[PDB]
């Protein structure tokens, strides 16, 4: 069967690093970077938080690409910002267009202070907390969170090995 991995979480949490490693581990997979999709719009571009229209478009494009990759016998690894609402919506569509698809929802988390330093090497802040409090207030189940503040990057393959089979993320 096919598998969909919705890896989300605050900026600097290591979504990109985790998704790239995960994708490279499956025999047949597709890696979708939400940001590249969103930034495809040039003329008239506006950030996600300033246009529900442009944001819905981005999820439309993500969804259609995900369906095609799954139908094509590819596992899909999605890296983007996603809350219960978006995950639910995506799931409804794929499930209605593809059979035997086990979807996994995974929210990578570390520590407020960790994200504080993790970005101190981007191109030079407080904003790294804006997304943090959003996930919390959304009252998301605790089984979808994966705190890696105590793990080592040298164990990256174990982490991706876990979230690949761990049933807790199976999107109960």
Q: Which of 61, 93, 111, 162 binds a second copy (CB under 8 A)?
A: 61
Say whether residue 47 binds a second copy (CB under 8 A).
no
Residue 3: count other Cβ atoms within 10 Å of its Cβ: 19
Nearer to a second copy, 78 or 107 (CB): 78
Nearer to a second copy, 36 or 120 (CB): 36
First to last CA, the chain: 18
Nearest to 80 by CA among 68, 53, 62: 62
Say whether residue 65 binds a second copy (CB under 8 A).
yes
Nearer to a second copy, 47 or 125 (CB): 47
Torsion of CA 77, 25, 14, 63, to 10 degrees: 0
Instruction: Give least dist CB 34 to a second copy, A.
Output: 12
Measured CA to CA, the distance from residue 100 to residue 102 in angstroms comes to 6
Binding site for a second copy (CB under 8 A): 20, 23-32, 36, 40-44, 53, 57, 60-61, 64-65, 68-69, 72, 74-75, 77
């Amino acid at each position: 069967m096919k598998k969909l991995y919705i890896i989300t979480g605050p900026a600097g949490v290591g979504k990109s690093t985790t998704c790239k490693r995960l994708a490279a581990q499956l025999d047949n997979s597709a890696y979708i970077e939400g940001d590249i999709i969103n930034h495809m719009v040039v003329g008239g571009y506006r950030p996600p938080w300033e246009s529900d229209e442009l944001l819905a478009l981005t999820w439309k494009n993500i969804t259609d690409l995900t369906v095609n990759f799954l139908l094509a016998q590819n596992d899909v690894v999605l890296d983007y910002i996603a809350f219960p609402d978006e995950a639910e919506a995506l799931a409804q569509t794929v499930q209605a267009k593809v059979d035997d698809v086990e979807i996994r929802f995974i929210i990578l988390w570390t520590n407020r202070e960790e994200l504080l330093r993790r970005d101190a090497l981007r191109k030079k802040g407080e904003r790294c907390l804006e997304l943090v409090e959003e996930f919390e207030s959304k009252g998301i189940d605790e089984r979808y969170f994966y705190n890696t503040s105590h793990l080592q990057p040298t164990n990256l393959n174990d982490i991706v090995k876990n979230l690949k089979t761990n049933p807790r993320f199976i999107f109960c």
